[PDB]
Amino acid sequence: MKQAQQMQEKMQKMQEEIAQLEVTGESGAGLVKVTINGAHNCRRVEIDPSLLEDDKEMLEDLVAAAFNDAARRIEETQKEKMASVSSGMQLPPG
Amino acid sequence: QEKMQKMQEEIAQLEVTGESGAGLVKVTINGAHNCRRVEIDPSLLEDDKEMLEDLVAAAFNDAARRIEETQKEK
């Protein structure tokens, strides 16, 4: 606990680094973009004005596809942050 | 001390719908963060584009906060 607390509090700092990464998913090549952080909080949705005229249900599915594109991207980003932390030996050794 | 092999997986299959604007937008997701459906009220398409974008983000985040609340207690 001068040797087994600072695993748990190094763990917390790493959760915070992750939580702050972001990505931007898109559907229709950018007709909808969703920006989300490493804790799955949605920071920004952007919707092209051409989608508000017609097909509500088109707009709806493109929104959902954007979110799912952002979820896949954020999982990629997290996996790269785990690669980087581990290869970097960035934890207390043990 | 551990039974989370099968409890983060209960979360993962589970579905909540977040809402904003008092029901005007609803966003259904799972604990695996897949978005199943988005429902947007026709009134929002007229002129409030910035409003509509903020309400979408708020409904997703309501969903995400119910999923978090669900595994807070478990």
UniProtKB/Swiss-Prot annotation, chain A:
GO terms for molecular function: DNA binding. The keyword Transmembrane does not apply. Keywords: Cytoplasm, DNA-binding. InterPro entries: YbaB-like_sf, YbaB/EbfC. One of its GO terms (biological process) is response to stress. Belongs to the YbaB/EbfC family. Binds to DNA and alters its conformation. May be involved in regulation of gene expression, nucleoid organization and DNA protection. Homodimer. This is Nucleoid-associated protein YbaB. It comes from Escherichia coli (strain K12).
Curated annotation (Swiss-Prot), chain B:
One of its GO terms (biological process) is response to radiation. The keyword DNA-binding applies. The keyword Transcription regulation does not apply. Keywords: Cytoplasm, DNA-binding. One of its GO terms (molecular function) is DNA binding. One of its GO terms (cellular component) is bacterial nucleoid. It is found in: Cytoplasm, Nucleoid. Its main location: cytoplasm. Homodimer. Binds to DNA and alters its conformation. May be involved in regulation of gene expression, nucleoid organization and DNA protection. Belongs to the YbaB/EbfC family. This is Nucleoid-associated protein YbaB. It comes from Escherichia coli (strain K12). The gene is ybaB. The chain holds residues 18 to 91 of 109 of the full protein.
